Design a protein around this motif. Structure first.
Motif, PDB file in Angstrom:
ATOM      1  N   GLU D 124       7.239  11.186  -5.962  1.00  9.60           N
ATOM      2  CA  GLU D 124       6.538  11.089  -4.685  1.00  9.60           C
ATOM      3  C   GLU D 124       6.703  12.354  -3.858  1.00  9.60           C
ATOM      4  OE1 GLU D 124       7.994   7.627  -2.732  1.00  9.60           O
ATOM      5  OE2 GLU D 124       6.933   6.218  -4.036  1.00  9.60           O
ATOM      6  N   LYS D 125       7.825  13.052  -4.012  1.00 10.89           N
ATOM      7  CA  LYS D 125       8.048  14.322  -3.332  1.00 10.89           C
ATOM      8  C   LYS D 125       7.453  15.506  -4.082  1.00 10.89           C
ATOM      9  CE  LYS D 125      12.273  12.907  -0.941  1.00 10.89           C
ATOM     10  NZ  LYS D 125      12.290  11.493  -1.405  1.00 10.89           N
ATOM     11  N   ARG D 126       6.743  15.257  -5.183  1.00 16.53           N
ATOM     12  CA  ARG D 126       5.992  16.280  -5.911  1.00 16.53           C
ATOM     13  C   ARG D 126       6.890  17.252  -6.670  1.00 16.53           C
ATOM     14  NH1 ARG D 126       2.585  16.417  -1.373  1.00 16.53           N
ATOM     15  NH2 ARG D 126       4.532  16.835  -0.243  1.00 16.53           N
ATOM     16  N   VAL D 127       7.909  16.724  -7.349  1.00 18.85           N
ATOM     17  CA  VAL D 127       8.599  17.500  -8.375  1.00 18.85           C
ATOM     18  C   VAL D 127       7.910  17.292  -9.720  1.00 18.85           C
ATOM     19  CG1 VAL D 127      10.835  18.041  -9.385  1.00 18.85           C
ATOM     20  CG2 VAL D 127      10.708  17.127  -7.058  1.00 18.85           C
ATOM     21  N   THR D 191      -0.618  10.914  -3.097  1.00 20.08           N
ATOM     22  CA  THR D 191      -1.911  11.050  -2.437  1.00 20.08           C
ATOM     23  C   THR D 191      -3.061  10.749  -3.385  1.00 20.08           C
ATOM     24  OG1 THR D 191      -3.382  12.621  -1.322  1.00 20.08           O
ATOM     25  CG2 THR D 191      -1.820  13.519  -2.926  1.00 20.08           C
ATOM     26  N   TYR D 192      -2.852  10.919  -4.688  1.00 22.37           N
ATOM     27  CA  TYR D 192      -3.903  10.742  -5.679  1.00 22.37           C
ATOM     28  C   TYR D 192      -3.817   9.399  -6.398  1.00 22.37           C
ATOM     29  CZ  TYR D 192      -5.682  15.500  -5.261  1.00 22.37           C
ATOM     30  OH  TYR D 192      -6.268  16.657  -4.804  1.00 22.37           O
ATOM     31  N   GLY D 193      -2.991   8.478  -5.913  1.00 25.34           N
ATOM     32  CA  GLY D 193      -2.915   7.143  -6.471  1.00 25.34           C
ATOM     33  C   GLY D 193      -1.500   6.765  -6.872  1.00 25.34           C
ATOM     34  N   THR D 194      -1.431   5.820  -7.803  1.00 27.60           N
ATOM     35  CA  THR D 194      -0.155   5.268  -8.232  1.00 27.60           C
ATOM     36  C   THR D 194       0.276   5.876  -9.560  1.00 27.60           C
ATOM     37  OG1 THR D 194      -0.617   3.172  -7.113  1.00 27.60           O
ATOM     38  CG2 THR D 194       1.071   3.168  -8.823  1.00 27.60           C
ATOM     39  N   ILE D 195       1.582   6.090  -9.705  1.00 27.63           N
ATOM     40  CA  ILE D 195       2.183   6.481 -10.974  1.00 27.63           C
ATOM     41  C   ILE D 195       3.282   5.479 -11.300  1.00 27.63           C
ATOM     42  CG2 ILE D 195       3.174   8.340 -12.331  1.00 27.63           C
ATOM     43  CD1 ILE D 195       2.311  10.220  -9.967  1.00 27.63           C
TER      44      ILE D 195
END
Ligand SMILES: [Mg+2]
Ligand SMILES: [Mg+2]
Ligand SMILES: [Mg+2]
Ligand SMILES: [Mg+2]
Ligand SMILES: [Mg+2]
Ligand SMILES: [Mg+2]
Ligand SMILES: [Mg+2]
Ligand SMILES: [Mg+2]
Ligand SMILES: [Mg+2]
Ligand SMILES: [Mg+2]
Ligand SMILES: [Mg+2]
Ligand SMILES: [Mg+2]
Ligand SMILES: [Mg+2]
Ligand SMILES: [Mg+2]
Ligand SMILES: [Mg+2]
Lengths: 102, 50, 151, 215, 100
Positions: D124-127, D191-195
């Motif tokens: 979620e923090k974009r690592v 931002t682009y959905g669920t992972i």
RNA sequence: GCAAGACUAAAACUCAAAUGAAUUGACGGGGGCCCGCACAAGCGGUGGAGCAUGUGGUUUAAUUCGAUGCAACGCGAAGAACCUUACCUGGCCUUGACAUACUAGAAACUUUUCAGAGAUGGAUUGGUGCCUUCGGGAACCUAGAUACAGGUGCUGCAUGGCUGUCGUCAGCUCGUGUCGUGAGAUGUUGGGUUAAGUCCCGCAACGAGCGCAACCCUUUUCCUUACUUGCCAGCAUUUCGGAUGGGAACUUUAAGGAUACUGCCAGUGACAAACUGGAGGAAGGCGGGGACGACGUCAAGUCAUCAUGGCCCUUACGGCCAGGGCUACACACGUGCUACAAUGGUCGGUACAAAGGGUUGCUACACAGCGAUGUGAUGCUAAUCUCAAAAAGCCGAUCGUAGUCCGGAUUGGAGUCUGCAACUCGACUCCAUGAAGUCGGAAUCGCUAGUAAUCGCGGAUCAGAAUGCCGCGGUGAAUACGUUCCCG
């Protein structure tokens, strides 16, 4: 041969389409006659409500008297194109199978 | 198990209830008080009838 | 199958006559697991046939069975895209099975009121030498005789 | 194809249920619904305390919740005031009063749920997803699990086409019912959905069956 | 389901709870033999004049978690979709897979 | 050059490739080797008729939305009279039926009617509660204002989670080494063998992981614990009913244990794995079933369980309501039920189960009724009372091949029950009626043993509404020479 054609929600179907499909399919495959007892064609639009080069899927599956049922698929941009491609592929497949079995 | 349409794909679950019976006869005043004093663990519902 | 050799099951002898052959015949007659009605039918037929001539029912049955058993059959062999019906000998178990099936089917296609009566009529006809089972035996001999030429 | 729940397949074999109480056929539904409500409340309250398990027990006309936490300090409270509020909320939720107990986790990197939350936080923090995956795998294997497996699926990197990527090391014999396998699932909202994130950790084979578990 | 569906279900339950006592008393009066015929007829009229939502026959079971009106499974109170998840997480006591 | 034609030999235009050797798969009317109800040998079906159910087309105001070859079509739906309901006709509300934030007054609540189809609106009673450093606060309402709520609206081709299929098919891959300029190869290949990448021998391979098998549930034999409510072998008493005083033997009930390992004998094979024939045993070479779904494939299915990115409506694509619809009917398909009878129908007597359900329920027993049922009443929170009658079966009588003493669709009268309410549109009972059907085209399906065929019983959903689905037991078969041609 009895003809059972079905579509999906995207494609939109009518009894006019049923009559036309039955007539064309019988006209093309009239030679085999007794060899074959059932046809079922199916129509879909894949990414319904959008567009593309193919964007439509036709299928035809036929039961030959004797040997097992055989199926064919085609993708095309229009219903007529899909039908024509599927008809050509069925003709080739049936010719090959009948030549094989002699 | 399928959200929309697969009638033959299912999960079969079961739950079992186990019952046990005990009688105590010729009980004494100390025995009854001991039984009442005894603690109860979860998952086992115990009914006492006089 | 492609492997294994399945063993044969054992059929207990019938109550009255203690005959495994008669028990197997009852099993051929039986439908929907109604073996009690099967025994009733078979025993009624046997009593009816015994009435006509005084002989041992078991001996009469086995004599008629020998009369009706086949000799030779062909098994279709597909080589070169042709039927090639090739005559061959058949094992005693198959002989007995086809004989019993023919008897029961001929009785079923006869035209008397009850299965016992028409089974008794078929047994009498087979003993005489003129029946539908006799005709199937004749036909199988005729065809295996026409095709004797091949091994 | 599809696979059975690793915990779901071993309830009566080497694992125990997360709820232990008896109910008559009439109060069963009420008990289950209220247990689900209290679990939903606890999950939201203790989001940042690294909680691993909740054990709900109804001994007799009362309740007992056991919370497994990596950070007992936050849940306990500096002066112990937080636990009082927690029991008050639990008694409000459940008709009979509830008592809380705390189980301290001393090897957090052996717990599947904690690893999944840790990976989801970074995601979620974009690592980088396969940076977080390798970090988690190495940490668990250093901890001492005989094997770990990580699965991450979705729009990884913002790609238009979703995909799934996984990494495994060690042993994860799912088909062995006598093996201790911890399974966890987590969701990352980007931002682009669920992972989606799935974690499997294998702690060797349990011996002696359910009797060893002392059920 | 929609929050409107859930709220309709709740108001129906509230009305049934409100009018249960009067409904039961009227039915007892209707089924009472010693009571007069005119009294029985008046009880029937009052029962027919009660509000519609007071009737328990108008209630539909729902999942509770999701409000789904199918696959309810009275005992658990959850529709199949959520019941499977809760069971196979290990949160439902006593329930296991079946093999016999 | 007689001829056929031979030799010498361009340009215009057009393409971004065309090619050689070799590497991984796929495929072959190429080849060998195996397997599977795939063939073969058999038993019973569908395709004909009446009815049920789902779909397609037409129809309507609406016939709400999804599922579409095998792998959609008794599928989501484990159950549409109102409700469910998402659709249509009409009547209504706008910070909204539901959340947080701001202000002010009121306990919350409570009794009656009136208008109306109802939603709603207008009147009219009773109470004034719980804590307070009482001058203020918790609950639960009313009134105003602003961000907002609300969406079963679109996109499964933007996704998470879940699911189908190839397919329980036996395979799929890594580390260190080696080999080759490289793609790559070996290992994973060769002999036997197994159900199986199961195992033993060789070998630039040596080692590992996911799959196979085992661990898990159930059934067959026996032992210990337990003697209830369940059981009755030796005793006795009996209104001869384990009923009673009794017993702890047997059946059973439900936890824990034992047993079966090619263990032993005779053969075969490399003296290997392994395979045949035997003794004993309840059971002998995986004993029979169930769960368990490898790496991967089809932009396969599901925004309508749910969550979620992005678009869309905001006095309506949101919310409340009464009626109607989802049940329509020139037709076409899929899955079933009942029959076409004498291996049977009807009547009288008479035996033998297993698994489940019951306090908003199951109800012994008496009466009333032809009956569905009703009234009184009894025991049950259940190994205790109850649903409950098991039916095929056996014994006796009649029917004697007839559209029948076979079949029970359709229609006309009379009722019971559930429910606010059975018109559209419920289940069942009685009287009368008595349709097609006399064994079903080409074609095609299931099944190898307690299986098929056939007979009855229970449950989830559920006020009521199963021929569907999930379970249970009774009677109980036929046939496998063989893999040659059929397919995967
Ligand atoms: Mg698609
Ligand atoms: Mg919603
Ligand atoms: Mg209802
Ligand atoms: Mg055949
Ligand atoms: Mg089906
Ligand atoms: Mg409706
Ligand atoms: Mg998809
Ligand atoms: Mg679609
Ligand atoms: Mg296995
Ligand atoms: Mg949709
Ligand atoms: Mg309505
Ligand atoms: Mg419908
Ligand atoms: Mg009749
Ligand atoms: Mg006629
Ligand atoms: Mg019902």
């Amino acid at each position: 041969m009895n003809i059972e054609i079905r579509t999906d929600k995207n494609i939109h179907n009518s009894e006019r389409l049923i009559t036309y499909v039955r007539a064309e399919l019988t006209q093309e495959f009239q030679r085999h006659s007794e060899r074959i007892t059932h046809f079922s064609v199916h129509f879909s639009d894949e990414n319904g409500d959008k567009g593309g080069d193919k964007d439509i899927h036709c299928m035809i599956e036929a039961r030959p008297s004797g040997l097992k049922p055989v199926a064919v698929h085609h993708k095309a941009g229009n219903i007529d194109a899909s039908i024509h491609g599927a008809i050509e592929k069925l003709k080739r497949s049936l010719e090959h199978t009948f030549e094989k079995k002699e | 198990t399928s959200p929309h349409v697969n009638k033959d794909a299912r999960d079969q679950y079961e739950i079992r209830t186990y019952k046990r019976l005990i009688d105590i006869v010729q009980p004494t005043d100390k025995t009854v008080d001991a039984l009442m004093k005894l603690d109860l663990a979860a998952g086992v519902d115990v009914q006492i009838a006089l | 199958p492609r492997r294994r050799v399945v063993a044969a099951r054992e059929i207990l002898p019938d109550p009255k006559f203690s005959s495994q052959t008669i028990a197997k015949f009852m099993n051929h007659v039986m439908q929907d697991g109604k073996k009690s009605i099967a025994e009733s039918i078979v025993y009624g037929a046997l009593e009816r046939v015994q009435e006509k001539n005084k002989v041992d029912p078991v001996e009469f049955f086995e004599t008629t069975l020998e009369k009706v058993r086949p000799m030779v059959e062909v098994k279709a062999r597909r080589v070169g895209g042709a039927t090639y019906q090739v005559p061959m000998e058949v094992r005693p178990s198959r002989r007995t099975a086809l004989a019993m099936r023919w008897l029961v089917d001929a009785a079923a296609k006869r035209s008397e009121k009850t299965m016992a009566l028409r089974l008794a009529g078929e047994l009498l006809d087979a003993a005489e030498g003129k029946g539908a089972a006799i005709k199937k035996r004749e036909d199988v001999h005729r065809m295996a005789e026409a095709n004797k030429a091949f091994s | 194809g599809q696979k059975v729940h690793p915990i779901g397949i071993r309830l009566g074999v080497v694992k125990r249920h997360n709820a232990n109480w008896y109910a008559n056929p009439k109060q069963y539904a009420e008990y289950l619904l209220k247990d689900l409500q209290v679990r939903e409340f606890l999950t939201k309250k203790l989001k940042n305390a690294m909680v691993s398990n909740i054990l709900i027990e109804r001994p007799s006309g009362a309740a007992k919740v056991t919370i497994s936490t990596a950070r007992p300090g936050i849940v306990i409270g500096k002066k112990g005031e937080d636990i009082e509020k927690l029991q008050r909320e639990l008694t409000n939720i459940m008709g009979v009063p509830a008592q809380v107990s705390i189980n301290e986790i001393d090897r957090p990197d052996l717990d599947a749920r904690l690893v999944a939350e840790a990976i989801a936080s970074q995601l979620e923090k974009r690592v980088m997803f396969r940076r977080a995956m390798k970090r988690a795998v190495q940490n668990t294997m250093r901890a001492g699990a005989k094997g770990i497996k990580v699965e991450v699926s979705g729009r990884l990197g913002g790609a238009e086409i979703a995909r799934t990527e996984w990494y495994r090391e060690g042993r994860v014999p799912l088909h062995t019912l006598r093996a201790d396998i911890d399974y966890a699932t987590m969701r990352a909202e980007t931002t682009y959905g669920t992972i989606g994130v799935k974690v499997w950790i294998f702690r060797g084979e349990i011996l002696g069956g359910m009797k060893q578990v002392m059920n | 389901a929609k929050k409107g569906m859930i709220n309709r279900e709740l108001k129906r339950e509230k009305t049934v709870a409100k009018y249960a006592a009067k409904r039961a008393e009227l039915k007892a009066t209707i089924a009472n033999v010693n009571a007069s015929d005119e009294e029985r007829f008046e009880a029937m009229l009052k029962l027919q004049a009660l509000p519609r939502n007071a009737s328990p026959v108008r209630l539909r079971n729902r999942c509770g978690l999701t409000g789904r009106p199918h696959g309810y499974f009275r005992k658990f109170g959850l529709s199949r979709n959520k019941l499977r998840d809760t069971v196979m997480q290990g949160d439902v006591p006593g329930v296991v897979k079946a093999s016999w």
